[PDB]
Each structure stands twice: as C-alpha cells, then as structure tokens.
Amino acid sequence: RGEVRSELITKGEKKLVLIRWNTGKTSAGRLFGRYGPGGRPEFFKLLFGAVAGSLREQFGPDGENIFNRIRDSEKFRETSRELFDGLKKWFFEEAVPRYNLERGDIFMISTELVLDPDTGELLWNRDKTQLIYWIRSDR
C-alpha cells in the first residue's frame, strides 16, 4: 500500500493537519534499518512525502512553501525523530513480542499524526497505531 489521507482541523485561528499514514507493506530492515533506499531507513522519506503531500492537499500550491519552511526547522526535524524512535520502540518492544514476529517478517503500520504547520510540530496519535502482519500458512 503506502497510503496517505489528510484533513484540516481548527483550533482557534490555527489550522492543523490530521494525517492518516500507512507505511505500506514492508519489513523492519527496510523501514527502520539500513536496507531501505541508500543504506537508510525508508521511514523519513515516506514520512516527508506524507507531510508534503498533505500540505499540498489541504493548502494548495502554497502548501509547498509551508513544507519548504518547516522541512529544515529544528521543531520538525526533532519531532520527526521522536516519531521514528517512538514507532520503532513500539514495534520492537510491543508489536514484536505481541505477535511473535520474526526476522524477515513483513507488515504494514497505519498510524495518525497531527502537524502544526506554524511551528512544524508533529504530534503522534499513538492510540491509533495499528499493525497488519503476515503469518506463515501452516498457522
């Protein structure tokens, strides 16, 4: 898969972006490790496309200006790292033992984020995080 959906929400005069993000069918090495494009976690590339795409959806072409501003701000970079660490921790420390996942297993994660386009602050709606995973036929 690899699906992104968004909508605006209003808080006083501020508009925020609710983003529903599915990573697509992937593996731990590809998503969180060095087997993704380059020798890099694909996570960041996926996340960044999800944000830029949602900004364009909700605010039109000036969405790209918003993105270009926040993209290299301390707040966006830091909170994107906090998302990466929090999701990775959730996957290895909760999902893996919960579902008896093994090395090389395939899965997709769907989660929800709220982006403050003013500050570049990215909030993880952890309560909505879900895993779909692939199980060996004999089970």
Query: From CA 98, how far away is CA 131, in angstroms rounded?
Result: 11
Query: From CA 102, how far away is CA 77, in angstroms rounded?
Result: 31
Query: From CA 23, how far away is CA 117, in angstroms rounded?
Result: 22
**Count of beta carbons in the 10 Å neighbourhood of residue 51:** 27
As beta bridge partners, residue 116 has 121
Q: Resolution of the experimental model in angstroms, please? A: 2.0
User: 3-state DSSP call for residue 92?
Assistant: helix
| Residue 27 vs residues 39, 41, 83, 89, 122: alpha-carbon distances, Å | 14, 11, 18, 15, 24
In words, the CATH class of domain 1-139 is alpha beta
At position 79, the amino acid (one-letter code) is: T
Domain ranges of the chain: 1-139
At position 28, the amino acid (one-letter code) is: A
PDB experimental method: X-ray
Query: From CA 55, how far away is CA 106, in angstroms rounded?
Result: 30
